[PDB]
């Protein structure tokens, strides 16, 4: 007879338990992951009403409110900084503007922060894969002054240093350098935060970006001259941070100054049979977005969400498919994943959205689904606790109810794409895996989650499949 809704609920609970056990057994098999390129410092301030109003008044209230109506491209004055914050509160929208002015950068440091944590997709994933999962990790740190180095947690996290010719791997706190602090000031505000007449529709953040190095992808000399020797020490690589690249720069350089070098790294990784996963974050420039699609055949794997997959369909699908993917309509998402895998021949695509994940793979097996389940629990644990510290904290995410609507979506999906096992579907020359996720009702954290999902699935899948 058909498995009822209450039966599929029990069945997903058992799959989640077994997948957590299998991931914990498999993860010790991973002998190294490389993470590149973006690592910075995040300085978080929880905005205060009086303090923010006083600063708007000091600088000139008429100049600030004008900036909310006509926003600039980047921050070049204190008026523009505080205009962007109030616009972010008014619209309720996640914004990030680059700080060009040295005077504003001094003003931001004096205003300060309530909390400091590692930033950047590579930097955050070093603390997760190295600190929590204990996988030996080499991370790219474009500028490593003391304030940056000491944001890394204890565990097997490593950065390359040159001893004349010989490359060594040491903890980041053992490699402090006289280098720039790359700080992103994150001004956070709750649901219905109010300042003057302006009031927030929902909770969000404005980011003031004072980081010259990750914006242009300037790489350490150890990754420029010693990449092959780094490669010899890992089995996996996760590449992120290319989404900032512009087609043209005012100094006449272009995006290929960085992408030719990235491609040279991929050539090395593939010569050593390292499996690589690209985080295809939204890339505003369409010519750069297309050059990154054309680099996908040299990756093993790609991670993307509904905005990021819709964006890629705008350049290689069609606009109507892109619209449907943006909304997370499962059959259009599948069609899009298939179009991307037909265009690139990439072996793995992991899609993640609100309620469910999909993974389309050229190879077959239950490990693909169990890695998705582990990633779901890692994400729910991070959102629950704010930041994770040990891998046993992810066990508590087993208590978070699985999203019941996505259990029902599984039926709809299965009527067209028959399953051979729960969450697992054969196609002619590929496999599709589906899991319903764990949505945390009152999350302590809303940032770093997408990377947590995408990294955790890729690394635990490899660990489980390794033979």
Residue numbers in the entry: 1 to 467
Excerpt from the publication:
One of these major differences is the presence of ADP-dependent glucokinases (GKs) and phosphofructokinases (PFKs), instead of the classical ATP-dependent kinases. Even though these ADP-dependent kinases show no sequence similarity to ATP-dependent enzymes known to date, the determination of their three dimensional structures allowed their reliable classification as members of the ribokinase superfamily. In addition to this core ribokinase-like fold; other members of this superfamily have an extra small domain, which in the case of the ADP-dependent kinases is formed by a five stranded β-sheet with some α-helical insertions, the active site lying between the two domains. Our results indicated that Mg·AMP behaves as a competitive inhibitor of Mg·ADP and as a mixed type inhibitor with respect to D-glucose; the other product, D-glucose-6-P presents a mixed type inhibition versus either Mg·ADP or D-glucose. These patterns of inhibition are consistent with an ordered sequential mechanism in which Mg·ADP is the first substrate to bind to the catalytic site and Mg·AMP the last product to be released.
We determined the crystal structures of TlGK in its apo form (absence of ligands) and holo form, in the presence of D-glucose and the nonhydrolyzable ADP analog ADPβS (ternary complex, ADPβS·D-glucose). Both structures were obtained by molecular replacement, and refined to 2.05 and 2.58 Å resolution, respectively. The overall structure of TlGK in both states (apo-enzyme and ternary complex) shows the same two domains organization described previously; the large domain harbors a Rossmann fold (α/β/α) architecture with a central twelve stranded β-sheet surrounded by thirteen α-helices and three 310 helices, and the small inserted domain consisting of five β-strands and four α-helices. When the enzyme is in ligand-free state (apo), the large and small domains are distant from each other and accordingly there are no discernible interactions between residues from either domain. In the absence of ligands, the mass centers of the small and large domain were separated by 29.4 Å, but when Mg·ADPβS and D-glucose were simultaneously bound to the active site, the two domains underwent conformational changes causing the inter-domain distance to shrink by nearly 3 Å, that to 26.5 Å. Cluster 2 involves Arg202 (small domain) and Tyr354 (large domain). The distance between the two side-chain groups is reduced from 12.0 Å in the apo-enzyme to only 3.4 Å in the ternary complex (cluster 2). Cluster 5 is defined by interactions between residues Lys74 and Lys246 located in the small and large domain, respectively. In the apo-enzyme the distance between amine groups is >8.7 Å, whereas in the ternary complex this distance decrease to 4.0 Å, close enough to establish a repulsive interaction between the side chains of these Lys residues. For the apo-enzyme, the SAXS ab initio model suggests a more open conformation than the one found in the crystal.
